[PDB]
């Protein structure tokens, strides 16, 4: 249906301004404390502290197969990303540190996307 391809051209243009919002996230962190899946190689009791990890690369895969359907799904993720380091990690470290400022910081960034997101629709 023509419906279902002007559904389809929303989705594609929310995924480009998802992948904008995404990549002005990640520049907030400069150190790629947030870059990757934290390795159950190397932290192997990671699943019993944290039940739904998340990562900016598994976030960008989500985001190219279309995944998110609207701004909320989108943050959801990036709010797993802070609020899962800052459980695992206590406050005088550099991990818990990095997730306040990617935080502080992507909340300038959050903002204007949603007032794009309302307004573009």
Known sequence: SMEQVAMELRLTELTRLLRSVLDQLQDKDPARIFAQPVSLKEVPDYLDHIKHPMDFATMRKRLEA????????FEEDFDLIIDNCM???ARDTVFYRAAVRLRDQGGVVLRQA???VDSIG
């Open 87 to 89: 459980k695992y990690n």
């Open 66 to 73: 279309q995944g998110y359907k609207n701004l909320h799904e």
């Open 114 to 116: 949603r007032r794009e």
